[PDB]
Design a protein around this nucleic acid. Structure first.
Ligand SMILES: [Zn+2]
Ligand SMILES: [Zn+2]
Lengths: 326, 117, 662, 209, 91, 62, 199, 100
DNA sequence: GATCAAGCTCAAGTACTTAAGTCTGGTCTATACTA
DNA sequence: TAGTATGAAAGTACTTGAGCTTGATC
């Protein structure tokens, strides 16, 4: 054995046997301009990355049978509903009496600095005109959005669409990224090392973000995010987004980090020899039977490692010849 | 709003499922087995509390004051009877991050008044 | 059961009583002579005694022409005897008499002798039975899983494990199912309730939810109801269940029969085996679901798999009983086939030639000799490691081996959870004595004052409760379960009560006076959860503790005075326990107990820490085992060192036994 | 909704210009470092209305070594490109006697269209790219070293110097992001120059597969 | 036509089991529980199991719930392939 | 009980197994020591091919 | 003083006078603050013990030369052993909201959660001894479990790179004659003669 | 490959392979006489099915679903695969690492 | 303009392997058949 | 008789059914 990071043998393991589902995958997001110095814009970027579903900002949902929106069942929602129904905005004839009243919270809403407007646009985009949505102003003591279906039964479909929107509907952020942690790095390995006009090295203390997920293709393609230093520990994403030489270097950096965390040191020529052997064939040659017995090393060299009988079976059925080189 | 309780039929006592009367445009509760129907009185069929705004004062019970493993204090007396001694414990309930809150209960029998500071 | 076989004439072969003599040995001439343990260790014999059983065979052919025949003291087989036990020849002997037999008076015994090899049965840990445990697996289709390994009081079949799980969120909500025994497919809980005769959803919920004023639980059970509503009668419910099993009968008649017998014999055998399936099982299954709902809503904490209260120690008693039961069945089988091939020819048979006494003898001998716990043919399905060769390198090793425990998790497992020193090992197991190899934490050692319960029948307790103001489970109405407190006995829900305070005070007063309730009985009164669980089963590890009054101990000076003259006035530990001064507390009862390390903690301090103590430790050093108690100043060394010493004390030379020249 | 679309289009065009410049195509310096304001003034900021439309973003560049060796870059309007659009661009290329082209799709590409990208390979060497992977130039990353496509003469000299065959050099998948960026196919050798803490500079050579 | 079901019998006692079951059929054919099976085949070179000619596994079970020689096969029975009637009686 | 006299072991052209003509296992059988895979790996690192050959072929089962 | 500060932190959290830190839960914040107080006390007492050692002290003579031990060992033998950790966290509530039946329910204090305030010389109390046994057992379990995973890793690494060698043309090649590095370690130098330097 | 070692007495014990080959030669001879003279076809397939099970279990006993080739003392005869599958086998136990 | 079919893509299963090194000591190992 | 014979593993790679594009038809 800020955030929890896997180190030691489990991390060394996941590196040698390239795993598609690591235990603690994370990104290292670096900012470009003013956002790297101030915390307000950095928070804006954090909210622009951290995945936000309707459940994170919803306080409580409730399904009612409102036969006529003019005289609603609820007493506190009668003021803005007539202010919206006095004029024909949608097809009132294609309306259903089953109402889905959602109540949000000012706290989680103001932290992510969202607006009901954006939620309404996300709903009208994800479900089109088939699901009409309305909402009050940002002045009432309670945030509520009233939903209806346009035309399984309606009530059951609503309770099904209630959860559809409550989970998959991404209000803001990038999916697969659960949480993001912002902090100032005290260590110089994460600071911004620049060269002053006098020619001296200066380590600037700038804000950086650490995510709990891994989506490089989408995070790198964002404003105020540095497309040069932003990296990750998931070598699969590095190989899929940047390539084989990049994963070669990223793998060496991860191995060096695992070995140096305890203050130890290993010669770079060894880490390089390992990283090169795992990348000399264009693909991530995992240190396992699934990566070592799939190359042309000869049937005897493979049988000695693993799948001793099966390898010899394939070699016999194919008439393979071991050149006696290893 | 509050959660919504289940209504049982009078014939087979089974539960009814939300249904609507298209002619009069009114909410009805009918049994899916027999031909019984009932006029709803709440108009609400489903309520989901994402915030989990549960008042733990209803889940605690006065008999907990008989626990010798619980700590006792004389600094927070009871407001219903004036008893000095009272037991205090934490929430210990999942889905509640602010679990460090203390819940007090009066050790006096025939009272056991509960509260929070 | 009496084996009724017929070609016509029929015979039942019913047994009534047994008689076990002292250990004996028969030479070639056949002269019966008593065999002493030393003679067995020298001649490589087996220190076993013969088992004599009375048999009664009645002939029934036709016309009520019956006649009964009794075979008194029929030699059915030999049973190995534990040294120094009641039937051992070395019972009650003085140190001088033991010396005349060339035996060491200091030898604690507790081991067998098979072919001259001293074999010791290692106590095997196992998950407790008849108890509902709600767990939650991180990687599984179910969010919460409530299981209950059920087995009847008199175990007769393996533990029929039933699971009541809840489906993970992502049709509409979370569904509750039930993985019944002899069925390879999940079954909704409502179908099981309907199969028991409860078709009305209200009666089903009334057995599940005891307070209808809690709409949160009702909305959580609603998906299971809406999932299984086409079925509204018991016949179909049973037919559906029979269809889900691996033996789907082409005709719905035998399907219903298969489900009826499964729900009557395999599902919850400790909760019933007949009509009981609805009189109590529905109620129990309701509580089983109720625990799952309380767990999913966070109203209750999940159970920890590594808790001694939730575990049991399988000693020589419950182990050898499992063997004797399985072999007795094989004996009755062989006797069936033998007599069957005789009655088919239309003639009588002599049971003396039918009883293959070699079955019980060679079976127990093989099991205790090799360790494979099971039949000689199933040398791979059986679990080894039991019945190890007693270590005779030093007296500390011998004592440690006889007080050794073992967890069947498998040494291959790399999970640190089960190997960790749990908080519940206090006073019951030595925190230092454990191997440092590939079995760290799995192989443990009992503490000095640790006593594993032997077992007792719950009948007298049930008679007292029925005589008390307690109300039975079938006589009450479900509406009364809301405010009432539940009462369990060995995991069987018996009934409910209203004033549990005076109930506990009475049961405790009875246990402290050696009344109907014996000292090994555990009575745990969960206060937040209104359950009251009483236990009389075996394998419950417990230890003694000094009872404490308002603020003082009950162990007065008059007791120490009588204990000093223990050789004169014959006042021993039994008289101390009977005086209500000491109490045997188990790990499950310790949760509800507030201990005091020393009497100094009971005095008035500037700041009162507890001020409401209820028990006290005799001496804190008793938490140590045998190989750890020999360490001087163990509280001044690094814990690993104390562990390594506990492992070396068994390898140290000395005088392992006084009679080493023989 | 709109300012982000024009921002994406500008970033994609800049990356495409850098890509073509890296492949050896004649690209003017002005368009290589074009500010967002210059792009809005030359093309517009109203893609929702249609000004600029993705059809206007079409680029046509010529190689520094061969002026007739041109290359196309198309930006289809449909998120999921179908075979008909490829037939349109292929015919467009036939009309304009061009052999090499790039399709920058928005959401993705149909299977039949990918196969159409493989069967017309000897006649039209046309590639596909996702706008999501074009919003950033991977070669500016710190993990991605400097790649250089070697010529058949340089490869012959390399193989003759170290006295080895092509199958002995390390390999790189043709579908690799850098291999797609430089537009290299099977048989080509790419020279990688990376910094080394043991020697300062290390030059390796990878064969495409 | 009735189908053949394979029922396991004690090794070397198939002939005895067949004789016993036909005797029991003789004794109980006029009773309220007659045997609905049609015949039984015990090939001379087939040891370990025999064939019962019946339309239903229920009929087979009710026929073989006699002597204990067929207890092992009482739990379940196995159909004989349709093409296999011709091979059943070959010598 | 772990004395050195019960642990001291040596072997030089002793008995061999039947299936494979390699040394026995254990002091009780005058067995040889096991030149395991980890040892082979170590001598591979030393580049000692003759020693690795003598141990795996000439000193075990020629 | 450390125990008094922890009592104050507990009173703040019990009265809701403690706010969570950014990126951490209230419980996590409380435990971090408590762990910080205890760690500061252990360091302060350890420094005080180190300052009290004389030049003739043999423990100091062992730590200075580095032959065996460290300052931490001295701090545990003289001043205070410290907090016992299980899975990187304090002693968990094995019982129902309790670490042992000798403590009250919901007692997040130092002595209840495993703060061994005594030194190995002064002797551990019964509870501190049991908790220390927990802290030791986790080390034995790790030492007994990591051997299989690490040995399997050592085997996998060897079998994957057992034929890779430096050929006579100074390049590094495998058994298939393929090239992995044009020069060993990108510089063609052996790792024995090299050493650290400064540019 | 299948040495028949003598025990403490004159009694001779055969290897697992010998015990399996005996079963194979038994079922093979049965099949040969059952085909030389007219025999029930299902019977032939039966012995064949069994022959397939014997030949397979001689080279590979760890077949999922099928019963293990238990022979004397009701224990599965070691299959040629088990002799060289992994640890304590031929390659890793007698070729890569061996006694010296 | 629309359709059904072919067949390519995706998430659900099943089949199969692997699980540190070496060393010592100790016990124990089938009997049914049926003539 | 005398002897033959009968409940605390996890990972990858590959096959299968469901949904959907382009075609050939209409
Ligand atoms: Zn009804
Ligand atoms: Zn009060």
């Amino acid at each position: 054995n800020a955030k929890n990071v896997t180190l030691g043998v489990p991390r060394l393991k996941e590196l040698i046997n390239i795993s598609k589902k690591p235990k603690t995958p994370s990104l290292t997001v670096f900012l470009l301009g003013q956002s790297a110095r101030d915390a307000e814009r950095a928070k804006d970027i954090l909210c622009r990355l951290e995945h936000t579903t309707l459940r994170k900002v919803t306080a409580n949902t409730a399904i009612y049978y409102d036969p006529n929106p003019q005289s609603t069942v609820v007493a506190e929602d009668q003021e803005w509903v007539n202010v919206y129904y006095e004029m024909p905005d949608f097809d009132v004839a294609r309306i259903s009496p089953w109402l889905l009243r959602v109540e949000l919270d000012r706290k989680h809403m103001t932290d992510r600095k969202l607006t009901m407007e954006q939620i309404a646009e996300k709903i009208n985009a994800g479900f089109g005109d088939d699901l009409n949505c309305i909402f009050n102003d940002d002045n009432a003591e309670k945030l509520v959005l009233r939903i209806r279906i346009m035309n399984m039964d309606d009530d059951v479909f609503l309770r099904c669409i209630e959860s559809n929107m409550l989970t998959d509907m991404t209000l803001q952020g990038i999916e697969q990224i659960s949480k993001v942690y912002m902090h100032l790095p005290q260590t110089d390995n994460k600071k911004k090392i620049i060269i002053t006009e006098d020619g001296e090295f200066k380590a600037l203390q700038e804000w950086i973000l650490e995510t709990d997920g891994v989506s490089l293709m989408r995070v790198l393609s964002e404003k105020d995010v540095d497309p040069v230093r932003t990296t990750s520990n998931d070598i699969v994403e590095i190989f899929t987004v940047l390539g084989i030489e990049a994963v070669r270097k990223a793998l060496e950096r991860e191995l060096y980090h695992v070995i140096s965390f305890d203050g130890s040191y290993v010669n770079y020529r060894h880490l390089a020899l390992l990283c090169d052997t795992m990348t000399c064939r264009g693909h991530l040659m995992a240190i396992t039977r699934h990566g070592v017995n799939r190359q042309d090393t000869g049937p005897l060299m493979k049988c000695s490692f693993e799948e001793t009988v099966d390898v010899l079976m394939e070699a016999a059925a194919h008439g393979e010849s071991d050149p006696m080189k290893g | 709003p509050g959660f919504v309780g289940i209504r049982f039929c009078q014939e087979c006592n089974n539960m009814l499922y939300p249904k609507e009367d298209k002619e009069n445009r009114i909410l009805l509760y009918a049994c899916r087995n027999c031909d019984y129907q009932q006029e709803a009185d709440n108009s609400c069929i489903y309520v989901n509390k994402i915030t989990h705004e549960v008042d733990e004062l209803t889940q605690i019970i006065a008999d907990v004051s008989q626990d010798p493993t619980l700590p006792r204090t004389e600094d927070h007396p009871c407001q219903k009877c004036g008893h000095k001694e009272a037991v205090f414990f934490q929430s210990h309930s999942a889905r509640a991050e602010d679990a460090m809150r203390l819940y007090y209960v009066c050790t006096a029998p025939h009272c056991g008044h509960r509260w929070t500071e | 059961p009496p084996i009724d076989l017929q070609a016509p004439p029929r015979y039942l072969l019913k047994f009534e009583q047994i008689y076990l003599s002292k250990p004996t040995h028969w030479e070639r001439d056949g002269a019966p002579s008593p065999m002493m343990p030393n003679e067995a260790r020298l001649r490589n014999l087996t220190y076993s005694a013969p088992l004599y059983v009375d048999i009664t065979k009645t002939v029934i052919k036709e016309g009520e022409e019956q006649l009964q025949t009794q075979h008194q003291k029929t030699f059915i087989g030999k049973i190995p005897i534990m040294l120094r036990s009641t039937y051992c020849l070395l019972n009650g002997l003085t140190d001088r008499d033991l010396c005349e037999l060339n035996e060491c008076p200091l030898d604690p015994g507790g081991y067998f002798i098979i072919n001259g090899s001293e074999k010791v049965l290692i106590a095997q840990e196992k998950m407790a039975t008849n108890t509902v445990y709600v767990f939650a697996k991180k990687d599984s289709k179910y969010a919460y899983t409530g299981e209950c390994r059920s087995c009847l009081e008199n175990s007769s079949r393996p533990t029929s494990t039933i699971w009541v799980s809840m489906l993970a969120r992502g049709a509409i909500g979370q569904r509750i199912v039930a993985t019944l025994p002899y069925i390879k497919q999940e079954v909704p809980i409502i179908i099981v309730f309907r199969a028991l005769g409860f078709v009305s959803d209200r009666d089903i919920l009334e057995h599940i939810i005891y307070d209808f004023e809690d709409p949160e639980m009702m909305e959580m059970v609603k998906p299971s109801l809406d999932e299984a509503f086409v079925i509204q009668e018991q016949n179909v419910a049973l037919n559906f269940i029979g269809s889900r099993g691996a033996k789907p009968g082409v005709t719905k008649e035998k399907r219903i029969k298969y489900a009826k017998e499964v729900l009557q014999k395999e599902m919850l055998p400790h909760v019933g085996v007949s009509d009981f399936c609805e009189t109590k099982k529905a109620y129990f299954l309701g509580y089983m679901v109720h625990r799952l709902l309380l767990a999913a809503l966070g109203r209750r904490e999940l159970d920890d798999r590594d808790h001694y209260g939730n575990k049991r120690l399988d000693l020589a008693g419950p182990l050898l009983a499992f063997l004797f039961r399985g072999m007795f069945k094989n004996l009755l089988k062989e006797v069936r086939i033998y007599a069957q091939k005789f009655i088919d020819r239309g003639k009588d048979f002599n049971l003396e030639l039918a009883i293959k006494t070699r079955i019980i003898s060679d079976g127990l001998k093989y099991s205790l000799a090799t360790g494979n716990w099971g039949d000689q043919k199933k040398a791979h399905q059986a679990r080894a490691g039991v019945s190890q060769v007693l270590n005779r390198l030093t007296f500390a090793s011998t004592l440690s081996h006889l007080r050794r425990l073992n967890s069947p998790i498998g040494r291959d497992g790399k999970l640190a959870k089960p190997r960790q020193l749990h908080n519940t090992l206090w006073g019951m197991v030595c925190p230092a004595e454990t191997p440092e190899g590939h079995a760290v934490g799995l192989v443990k050692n009992l503490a000095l004052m640790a006593y594993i319960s032997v077992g007792s029948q719950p009948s007298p307790i049930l008679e007292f409760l029925e005589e008390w103001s307690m109300e039975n489970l079938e006589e009450i109405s479900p509406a009364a379960i809301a405010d009432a407190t539940k009462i369990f006995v060995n995991g069987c829900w018996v009934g409910i009560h209203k004033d549990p305070e005076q109930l506990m005070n009475t049961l405790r007063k009875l246990r402290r006076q050696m009344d109907i309730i014996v000292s090994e009985v555990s009575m745990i009164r969960d206060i937040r959860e209104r359950e009251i669980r009483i236990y009389t089963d075996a394998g419950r590890i417990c230890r003694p503790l000094l009872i404490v009054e308002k603020q003082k101990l009950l162990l007065k000076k008059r007791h120490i005075d009588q204990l000093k003259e223990r050789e004169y006035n014959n006042y021993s530990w039994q008289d101390l326990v009977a005086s209500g001064v000491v109490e045997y507390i188990d790990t499950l009862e310790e949760e509800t107990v507030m201990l005091a390390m020393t009497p100094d903690d009971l005095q008035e301090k500037e700041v009162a820490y507890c001020s409401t103590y209820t028990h006290c430790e005799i001496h804190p050093s008793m938490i140590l085992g045998v190989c750890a108690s020999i360490i001087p100043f163990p509280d001044h060394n690094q814990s690993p060192r104390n562990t390594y010493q506990s492992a070396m004390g068994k390898q140290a030379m000395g005088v392992y036994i006084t009679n080493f020249h023989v | 909704d709109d300012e982000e679309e024009t921002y994406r289009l500008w970033k994609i065009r800049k990356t495409i210009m850098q890509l073509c410049h890296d492949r050896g195509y004649l690209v003017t310096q002005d368009e290589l470092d074009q500010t967002l304001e210059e792009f809005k003034a030359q093309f517009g900021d109203k893609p929702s209305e249609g000004r600029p439309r993705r059809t206007d973003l079409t680029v046509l560049v010529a190689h520094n070594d061969d002026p007739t060796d041109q290359m196309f870059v198309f930006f289809p309007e449909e998120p999921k490109v179908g075979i008909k659009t490829i037939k349109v661009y292929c015919q467009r290329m036939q009309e304009e006697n061009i052999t090499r082209a790039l399709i920058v799709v928005q959401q993705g590409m149909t299977p039949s269209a990918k196969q159409s990208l493989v069967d017309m390979a000897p006649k039209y060497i046309l590639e596909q790219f996702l706008q999501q992977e074009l919003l950033i130039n991977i070669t500016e990353h710190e993990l991605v070293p400097e790649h250089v496509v070697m010529t058949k003469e340089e490869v012959t000299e390399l193989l003759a110097r170290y006295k080895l065959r092509e199958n002995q050099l390390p390999r790189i998948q043709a579908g690799d992001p850098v291999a797609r960026y430089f537009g290299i196919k099977r048989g080509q050798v790419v020279k990688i120059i990376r910094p080394s803490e043991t020697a300062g500079r290390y030059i390796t050579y990878r064969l495409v597969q | 036509d009735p189908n053949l079901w394979t029922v396991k019998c004690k090794i070397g006692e198939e002939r005895a089991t067949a004789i016993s079951l036909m005797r029991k059929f003789i004794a109980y054919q006029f009773t309220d529980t007659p045997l609905q099976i049609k015949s039984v085949v015990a090939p001379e070179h087939v040891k370990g199991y025999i064939y019962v000619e019946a339309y239903k596994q229920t009929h087979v079970k009710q026929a073989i719930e006699g002597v204990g020689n067929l207890r092992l096969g009482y739990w379940n029975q196995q159909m004989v392939p349709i093409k296999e009637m011709t091979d059943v009686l070959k010598v | 009980k772990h004395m050195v006299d019960d642990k001291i072991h040596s072997r030089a052209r002793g008995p061999i197994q039947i299936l494979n003509r390699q040394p026995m296992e254990g002091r009780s059988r005058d067995g040889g020591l096991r030149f395991g895979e980890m040892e082979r790996d170590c001598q591979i690192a030393h580049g000692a091919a003759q020693f690795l050959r003598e141990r795996l072929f000439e000193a075990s089962d020629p | 003083k450390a125990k008094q500060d922890v009592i104050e932190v507990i009173e703040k959290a019990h009265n809701n006078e403690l706010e969570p830190t950014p990126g951490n839960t209230l419980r996590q914040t409380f435990e971090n603050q408590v762990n910080r107080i205890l760690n500061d006390a252990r360091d302060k007492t350890g420094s005080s013990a180190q300052k009290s050692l004389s030049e003739y002290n043999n423990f100091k003579s062992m730590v200075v030369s580095g032959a065996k031990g460290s300052k931490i060992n001295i701090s545990q033998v003289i001043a205070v052993v410290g907090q016992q950790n299980v899975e990187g966290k304090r002693i968990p509530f094995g019982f129902k909201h309790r670490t042992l039946p000798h403590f009250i329910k919901d007692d997040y204090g130092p002595e209840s959660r495993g703060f061994v305030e005594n030194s190995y010389l002064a002797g551990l109390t019964p509870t501190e001894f049991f908790f220390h046994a927990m802290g030791g057992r986790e080390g034995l379990i790790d030492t007994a479990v990591k051997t299989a995973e690490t040995g399997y890793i050592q085997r996998r690494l060897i079998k994957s790179m057992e034929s890779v060698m430096v050929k006579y043309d100074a390049t590094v090649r495998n058994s298939i004659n393929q090239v992995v590095q044009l020069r060993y370690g990108e510089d063609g130098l052996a790792g024995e003669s090299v050493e650290f330097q400064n540019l | 490959v299948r040495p028949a070692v003598v025990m403490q007495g004159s009694a001779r014990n055969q290897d697992d392979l010998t015990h399996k080959l005996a079963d194979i030669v038994k079922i093979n001879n049965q099949l040969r006489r059952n085909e030389q003279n007219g025999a029930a076809a299902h019977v032939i397939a039966e012995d064949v099915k069994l022959l397939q099970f014997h030949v397979a279990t001689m080279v590979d006993n760890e077949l999922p679903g099928l019963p293990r080739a238990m022979q004397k003392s009701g224990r599965p005869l070691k299959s040629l695969k088990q002799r060289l599958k992994g640890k304590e086998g031929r390659v890793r136990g007698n070729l890569m690492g061996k006694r010296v």
